[PDB]
């Protein structure tokens, strides 16, 4: 029943789902410590949020931003996807 | 050109059909062991300095030769999907 | 087959006191022709080295009993003053042409092989003139004129070929 | 060997120095050969007088200039990547407004390159070239209006690039217009600025052109003299104060803008000649006494109302016309850039006066080589003009040494507007070889100069021409200008002559660039020779007169791509320029004077001149060519031999006995073979490869430098981190590979450390010949920063013609080499002597180039007659004479057959039998004569050799001249399967031990898509590239004898999915019925 793919969906991603496909949240800009070539805790290369570096680029994490932000694409794109949505000055 | 290539095209309802058929049987010939043939008696493919081309020459080269004879049968939904590698691996070592 | 010069590393060099460069002489060498006097002389190597102003003739070589050189006048090179002429001329009796980079003769670590120039045949031609005798005029009179470098005389070459032929004719024995 | 030339025309004055184009150009440019006493001017000196008189009070002028002490000799610079310059000093003093001081201390500013004996330059270790350039001699010109057939438009353009483009357009609606910096304005205004008053203006102006009221209109503004200038400025877009800031104006005074070209020709020409008369100053200058005088505006317009009205002399100048197109030789180009640095130098001295600490400064305080030197180094190494000296062989360089192009500084010719200049113009006649242009794009944009044609005082390529009084030919000649040429009636050199007078009454001649028939009475001049019509590159073709200009162009350039074969052979047929070529080319060396031979060493040549002296000459054994080839000198003399001044000492790279020899004259039997000579395929007898006929020497310069990283400098040594000894054997020295070693693909030549050793790149290497290093203690080398040391490895090998070899003829017939049948079954002549090369006749028709067919026949006689021939371009041998000598040859080929005691062959019967049935032989005649008469046609019987059965029908034979080209099979032989990968993306790129698989491109894919090879295609886009998983997965299956892996999802698929996820994009993969689908 593993029927090959024939359909591809493209739509906005809800914050909830954001965590869905997320396996851990890095909350520190600590790439890799210089003493040990091993990543620094919940850094951009932790072995728990992503995975082993030996016998890892198929697992994603997230950054629960403090205060909500915005996906520039839905505001800066020619037709203000959201601006025109609320009548607000599309670009201004 | 290739052996009775024409006779082949005439057996299929579409050029591309042949290809997919030749390829599928070609694999089953090597993976499922090289003894699934149906024309092994005589007129079987041969080599040169040593006519040892009686065991493992080239996949497709055999596949087509098999279709040369209306011994086999093909279609869209002939035999159940999964029931494929099940009846084949058990019947052949 | 190959040569090794004392004061040389590569065939693209030149020796002091020596007029013609390496490649120049090497070429004048293959132009040489020799004659063995026994089926054993499968591999022979001569040597020569003169000094001061003089024409380097092939004859100046050191005679090696059996093997003989039918190419005396061959002007190989010339030495100005105190020309350090030293070499190692490997000679073999093979067949036909053979790439210098196909056999790779290494008589010495810094020696460079050459190309095969056997086939003691300059040019051959056959004339199929009319007849001379016989009550029939629709006959032939084959007559061939051959030229040899010196190794083997026309006759020699003749018999050989004719024989190679004969022998070949037997291969058509065991059917299938 | 015998030498017969069919020269009917009395070639008066020999060919001038084929290199004088670059030679004198540099000489006169920088007057250095003679002391500053012989105060020339033009070039260097003139450059000084120009921006030297500096006054801001700053008062420093020029005194004397000298220099020329090359730090290192030629070779040194080459191998040491050094720059062949020359210390440039300068003597100048300073005088104050307060009487006193005369400080003149030797002040030098940077060094300048020099021109080689051959006429090249050695910038940085490499030899380059300063190609000439064309353009429109900055002058006055009138040409019709754009898309309006109405009136016309005047144009003035005084270079350098710092010269404003002024134009005069006649606006019909009223008033004349003057275009400058994209803006039109009433010329009147300016005229007033010059002093031209209303009355004096109109009168002496529009006295004939009622249109005058189109400028004598200003009765409100043209009533204010000097005030006009204030207004003129108001025109300038900028909003600057209307004060005395007469800047922009003064700019067009006597300084730079108006071309400061020679006061007499450069500018005066387009002046006096076209319009006006005398040239006050050097350009439209004179800014003294406040007012301005310009005897330029009056004329330019006086000529305008002239053509727009009566017929003062039909002045509608032509564009392409060379008589208005100047050239830019090395001297001009260089001196030009020079003036740049000068102006940039003076930039400082001026500012170094405002801040000057009183009269306590003069030399250094006002000088700095920085600006000057910088410029020079920019031109000789950063200008598109200078290029890589094409040394594919002697000839090649020579051509690239005197070639010309339009493109350049930009202010002359662009790139997207010249389909007009690209075509051969009438004036190009004897000025620019019409068949010297390269192939592909840019064709026409670049094309060398003609033959005898030479540059003049200012570009304008002149040409020789025979003077004639009535019907008598004068032995005197003069280089006529492309302009003055049309003034007379020139006739051809073909014209029959009886000593010194014309022949027939109906003589051919070219009037004004137009072919006409004139009587022996109006003969003002005559062609000097067919040669001057084309350039050397073409003057080398056998019977040009029998080949199309299109196909000729091919063989022309082909000679430039020839390869210096080891066994040089001068063409069986020669144009007679081969002797001169090798000379001015400097491929070989000639004896300076008469004397006798001393030391004839394979490396050194010594001789004792009769004037009581002795000199030796360095014999460059095997030097590395710029294109990777041999450059030896074969001493063609012997110990003690009376020699004459200018005698052949040693042969050049492709020379032989003073005669050029780019290739060999092998036997040829043009006729279709077993298809082996299909399209352009060329068969060949092993016989040739036997006597090392077609072969050459190749070299490979692999360089390696010991970088100096901050992570531990790299050290050169036998130290290999992989304890490999099976490779350290040949690596004798401490890092460098032994000399005379046989390196193979993969072995190491030099050992690097941090193991970055320089291995033998893919393909081959050959046998090392010479290597040199450069430690820290630089004896005098400019070791690049961050470099501790450097090493070079000169490797080489022999190029024995094989299969992928390609060779063409001087006629333009190119073709690869298919099979090389052995002399055994090679078509032979009835009397032994087999053939050498088999060309397919099919390549003769469509390609109208009969010339070859000629050389062959001619050569067919040279084989038996044992001689070579020299046929002038169009004055070459003629059909009659040939058949004569050829017949004589028959009495040699067959003449001997007779006395030997043998007649015809039964085979020769059947052939002649079909010959008669083919109308080739006259029936009724005897076999003897039949063969003879047939031999005269250039065809002879020919036996197969394979079957012995001769080919029914004679086969035209002869000795054609062919040659191998630069393009070998070495630079092409990529065979990959498994190797490296793109460190960045994921592509099978090699470079070291393996190679890299050619690209696939969307094009090829498409076609693949068409076929429907879904899998074959998908296989190329994944399993053989990106998705590394399926790649290895596949490798296993293969080595395991299992079916190749079938990629379930290319790495590109899943990567993109999440790659989009990374930003909003909720890429959801659904199945056939709107259902989830696991991606990973």
From Swiss-Prot, chain A:
Signal peptide: none annotated. DNA-dependent RNA polymerase catalyzes the transcription of DNA into RNA using the four ribonucleoside triphosphates as substrates. The RNAP catalytic core consists of 2 alpha, 1 beta, 1 beta' and 1 omega subunit. When a sigma factor is associated with the core the holoenzyme is formed, which can initiate transcription. Belongs to the RNA polymerase beta' chain family. This is DNA-directed RNA polymerase subunit beta'. The gene is rpoC. The chain holds residues 1 to 122 of 1524 of the full protein.
UniProtKB/Swiss-Prot annotation, chain B:
It catalyses: RNA(n) + a ribonucleoside 5'-triphosphate = RNA(n+1) + diphosphate. Belongs to the RNA polymerase subunit omega family. Its EC number is 2.7.7.6. GO terms for biological process: DNA-templated transcription. Keywords: DNA-directed RNA polymerase, Nucleotidyltransferase, Transcription, Transferase. Promotes RNA polymerase assembly. Latches the N- and C-terminal regions of the beta' subunit thereby facilitating its interaction with the beta and alpha subunits. GO terms for cellular component: DNA-directed RNA polymerase complex. Coiled coil: none annotated. The RNAP catalytic core consists of 2 alpha, 1 beta, 1 beta' and 1 omega subunit. When a sigma factor is associated with the core the holoenzyme is formed, which can initiate transcription. One of its GO terms (molecular function) is DNA binding. This is DNA-directed RNA polymerase subunit omega. The lineage of its organism: Bacteria, Thermotogati, Deinococcota, Deinococci, Thermales. It comes from Thermus thermophilus (strain ATCC 27634 / DSM 579 / HB8). It comes from the Bacteria. HAMAP family: RNApol_bact_RpoZ (MF_00366). SMART domains: RNA_pol_Rpb6 (SM01409).
From Swiss-Prot, chain C:
Transmembrane segments: none annotated. Residues 1-176 are annotated as: Alpha N-terminal domain (alpha-NTD). One of its GO terms (molecular function) is DNA-directed RNA polymerase activity. DNA-dependent RNA polymerase catalyzes the transcription of DNA into RNA using the four ribonucleoside triphosphates as substrates. Keywords: DNA-directed RNA polymerase, Nucleotidyltransferase, Transcription, Transferase. Belongs to the RNA polymerase alpha chain family. It catalyses: RNA(n) + a ribonucleoside 5'-triphosphate = RNA(n+1) + diphosphate. It comes from the Bacteria. This is DNA-directed RNA polymerase subunit alpha.
UniProtKB/Swiss-Prot annotation, chain D:
Keywords: DNA-directed RNA polymerase, Nucleotidyltransferase, Transcription, Transferase. It catalyses: RNA(n) + a ribonucleoside 5'-triphosphate = RNA(n+1) + diphosphate. HAMAP family: RNApol_bact_RpoB. GO terms for biological process: DNA-templated transcription. NCBIfam families: PRK00405.1, rpoB. The RNAP catalytic core consists of 2 alpha, 1 beta, 1 beta' and 1 omega subunit. When a sigma factor is associated with the core the holoenzyme is formed, which can initiate transcription. DNA-dependent RNA polymerase catalyzes the transcription of DNA into RNA using the four ribonucleoside triphosphates as substrates. This is DNA-directed RNA polymerase subunit beta. It comes from Thermus thermophilus (strain ATCC 27634 / DSM 579 / HB8). Its EC number is 2.7.7.6. The gene is rpoB. Signal peptide: none annotated. Belongs to the RNA polymerase beta chain family. GO terms for cellular component: DNA-directed RNA polymerase complex. One of its GO terms (molecular function) is DNA-directed RNA polymerase activity.
């Amino acid at each position: 029943m593993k029927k090959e793919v024939r359909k591809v969906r493209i739509a906005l991603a809800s914050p909830e789902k954001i965590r869905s496909w997320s396996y851990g949240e890095v909350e520190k800009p600590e790439t890799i410590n210089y003493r040990t070539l091993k990543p620094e805790r919940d850094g951009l290369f932790d072995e728990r949020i992503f995975g082993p570096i030996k016998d890892r680029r198929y697992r994603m994490g997230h950054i629960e931003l403090a205060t909500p932000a915005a996906h520039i694409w839905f505001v800066k794109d020619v037709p203000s996807k959201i601006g025109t949505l609320l009548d607000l000055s599309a670009t201004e | 050109a290739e052996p009775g290539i024409d006779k082949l095209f005439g057996m299929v309802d579409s050029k591309y059909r042949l290809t997919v058929v030749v390829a599928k049987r070609a694999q089953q010939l090597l993976r499922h062991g090289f003894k699934n043939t149906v024309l092994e008696p005589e007129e079987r493919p041969k080599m040169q300095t040593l006519e040892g081309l009686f065991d493992d020459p080239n996949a497709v080269t055999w596949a087509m030769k098999e279709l040369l004879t209306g011994r086999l049968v093909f279609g869209e939904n002939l035999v159940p999907e999964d029931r494929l590698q099940k009846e084949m691996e058990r019947l052949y070592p | 087959t190959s040569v090794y010069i004392e004061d040389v590393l590569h065939e693209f060099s030149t020796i002091p006191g020596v007029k013609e460069d390496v490649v120049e002489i090497i070429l004048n060498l293959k132009e040489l022709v020799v004659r063995f006097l026994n089926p054993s002389l499968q591999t022979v190597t001569l040597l020569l080295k003169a000094e001061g102003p003089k024409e380097v003739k092939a004859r100046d070589f050191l005679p090696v009993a059996d093997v003989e050189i039918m190419n005396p006048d061959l002007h190989i090179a010339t030495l100005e003053e105190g020309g350090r002429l030293n070499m190692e001329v490997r000679v073999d009796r093979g067949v036909g042409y053979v790439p210098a980079e196909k056999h790779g003769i290494k008589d010495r670590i810094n020696a460079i092989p050459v190309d095969a120039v056997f086939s003691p045949v300059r040019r051959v031609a056959f004339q199929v003139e009319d007849t001379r005798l016989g009550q029939r005029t629709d006959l032939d009179k084959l007559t061939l004129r051959i030229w040899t470098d010196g190794s083997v005389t026309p006759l020699e070459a003749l018999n050989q070929a004719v024989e190679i032929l004969r022998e070949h004719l037997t291969y058509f024995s065991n059917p299938q | 060997m015998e030498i017969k030339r069919f020269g009917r025309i009395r070639e008066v004055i020999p060919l001038p120095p084929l290199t004088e184009i670059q030679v004198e150009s540099y000489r006169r440019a920088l007057q250095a050969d003679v002391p500053p006493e012989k105060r020339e001017n033009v070039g260097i000196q003139a450059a000084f007088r120009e921006t030297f008189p500096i006054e801001e009070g700053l008062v420093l002028d020029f005194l004397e200039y000298r220099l020329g002490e090359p730090p290192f000799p030629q070779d040194e610079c080459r191998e040491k990547d050094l720059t062949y310059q020359a210390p440039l000093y300068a003597r100048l003093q300073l005088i104050h407004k307060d009487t006193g001081l005369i400080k003149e201390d030797e002040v030098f500013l940077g060094h300048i390159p020099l021109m080689t004996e051959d006429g090249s330059f050695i910038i940085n270790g490499a030899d380059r070239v300063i190609v000439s350039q064309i353009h429109r001699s900055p002058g006055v010109y009138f040409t019709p209006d754009p898309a309006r057939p109405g009136r016309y438009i005047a144009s003035i353009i005084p270079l350098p690039k710092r010269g404003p483009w002024i134009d005069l357009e006649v606006e019909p609606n009223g008033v004349v217009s003057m275009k400058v910096n994209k803006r039109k304005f009433p010329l009147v205004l300016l005229l007033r600025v010059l002093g031209y008053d209303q009355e004096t203006l109109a009168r002496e102006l529009g006295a004939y052109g009622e249109l005058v009221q189109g400028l004598m209109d200003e009765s409100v503004f043209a009533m204010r003299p000097e005030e006009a200038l204030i207004r003129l400025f108001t025109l300038l877009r900028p909003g600057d104060p209307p004060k005395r800031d007469k800047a922009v104006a003064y700019v067009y005074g006597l300084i730079a803008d108006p071309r400061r070209y020679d006061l007499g020709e450069a500018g005066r020409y387009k002046a006096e000649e076209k319009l006006g008369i005398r040239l006050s100053g050097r350009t439209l200058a004179r800014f003294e006494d406040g007012e301005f005088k310009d005897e330029v505006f009056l004329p330019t317009l006086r000529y305008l109302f002239a053509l727009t009205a009566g017929v003062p002399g039909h002045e509608v100048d032509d564009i392409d016309h060379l008589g208005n197109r100047r050239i830019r030789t090395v001297g001009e180009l260089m001196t030009d850039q020079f003036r740049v640095g000068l102006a940039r130098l003076a930039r400082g001295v001026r500012e170094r006066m405002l801040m000057g600490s009183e009269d306590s400064l003069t030399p250094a305080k006002l000088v700095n080589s920085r600006p000057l030197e910088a410029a020079i180094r920019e031109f000789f190494s950063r200008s598109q003009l200078s290029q890589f000296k094409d040394e594919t062989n002697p000839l090649s360089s020579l051509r690239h040494k005197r070639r010309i192009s339009a493109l350049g500084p930009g202010g002359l010719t662009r790139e997207r507007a010249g389909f007009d200049v690209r075509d051969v113009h009438r004036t190009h006649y004897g000025r620019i070889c019409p068949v010297e242009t390269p192939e592909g794009a840019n064709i026409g944009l670049i094309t060398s100069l003609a033959a005898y044609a030479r540059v003049d005082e200012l570009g304008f390529i002149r040409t020789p021409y025979r003077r004639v009084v009535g019907g008598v030919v004068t032995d005197e000649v003069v280089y006529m200008t492309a302009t003055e040429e049309d003034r007379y009636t020139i006739a051809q050199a073909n014209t029959p002559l009886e000593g010194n007078r014309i022949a027939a009454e109906r003589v051919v001649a070219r009037r004004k660039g137009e072919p006409v028939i004139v009587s022996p009475e109006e003969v003002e001049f005559m062609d000097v020779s067919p040669k001057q019509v084309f350039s050397v590159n073409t003057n080398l073709i056998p019977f040009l007169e029998h080949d199309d200009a299109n196909r000729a162009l091919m063989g022309s350039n082909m000679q430039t791509q020839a390869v210096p074969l080891i066994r040089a052979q001068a063409p069986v047929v020669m144009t007679g320029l081969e002797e001169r070529v090798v000379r001015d080319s400097l491929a070989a060396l000639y004896a300076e004077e008469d004397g006798e031979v001393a030391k004839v060493d394979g490396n050194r040549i010594v001789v004792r001149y009769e004037d009581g002296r002795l000199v030796e000459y360095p014999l460059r054994r095997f030097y590395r060519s710029n294109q990777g080839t041999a450059l030896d000198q074969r001493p063609r003399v012997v110990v003690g031999q009376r020699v004459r001044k200018g005698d052949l000492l040693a042969d050049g790279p492709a020379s032989e006995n003073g005669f050029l020899a780019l290739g060999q004259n092998v036997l040829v039997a043009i006729m279709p073979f077993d298809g082996y000579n299909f399209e352009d395929a060329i068969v060949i007898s092993e016989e040739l490869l036997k006597r090392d006929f077609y072969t050459s020497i190749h070299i490979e310069r692999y360089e390696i430098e010991a970088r100096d990283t901050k992570l531990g400098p790299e050290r050169i040594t036998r130290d290999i981190p992989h304890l490999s000894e099976a490779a350290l054997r040949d690596l004798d020295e401490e890092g460098v590979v032994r000399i005379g070693a046989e390196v193979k693909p993969g072995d190491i030549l030099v050992g690097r450390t941090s193991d970055t050793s320089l291995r033998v790149p893919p393909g081959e290497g050959g046998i090392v010949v010479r290597t040199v290093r450069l430690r820290r203690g630089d004896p005098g080398v400019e070791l690049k920063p961050g470099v501790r040391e450097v090493v070079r490895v000169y490797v080489a090998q022999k190029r024995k013609l094989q299969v992928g070899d390609k060779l063409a003829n001087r006629h333009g017939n190119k073709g690869v080499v298919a099979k090389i049948l052995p002399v055994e079954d090679m078509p032979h002549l009835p009397d032994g002597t087999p053939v050498d090369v088999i060309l397919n006749p099919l390549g003769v028709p469509s390609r109208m180039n009969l010339g070859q067919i000629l050389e062959t026949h001619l050569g067919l006689a040279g084989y038996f007659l044992g001689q070579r021939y020299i046929s002038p371009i169009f004055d070459g041998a003629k059909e009659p004479e040939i058949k004569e000598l050829l017949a004589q040859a028959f009495e040699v080929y067959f003449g001997k057959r007779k006395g030997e005691g043998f007649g015809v062959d039964k085979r020769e019967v059947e052939v002649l039998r079909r010959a008669e049935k083919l109308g080739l032989v006259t029936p009724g005649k005897t076999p003897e004569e039949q063969l003879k008469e047939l031999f005269l046609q250039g065809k002879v019987v020919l036996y197969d050799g394979r079957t012995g059965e001769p080919i029914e029908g004679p086969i035209v034979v002869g000795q054609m001249f062919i040659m191998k080209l630069y393009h070998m099979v070495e630079d092409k032989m990529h065979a990959r399967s498994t190797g490296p990968y793109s460190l960045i993306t994921q592509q099978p790129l090699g470079g070291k031990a393996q190679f890299g698989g050619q690209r696939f491109g969307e094009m090829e894919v498409w076609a693949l898509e068409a076929y429907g090879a879904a899998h074959t295609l998908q296989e190329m886009l994944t399993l053989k590239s990106d998705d590394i998983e399926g790649r290895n997965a596949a490798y296993e299956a293969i080595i395991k004898g299992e079916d190749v892996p079938e990629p379930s999802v290319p790495e590109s698929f899943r990567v993109l999915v999440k790659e989009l996820q990374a930003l909003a994009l909720d890429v959801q993969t659904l199945d056939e019925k709107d259902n989830p689908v696991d991606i990973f």
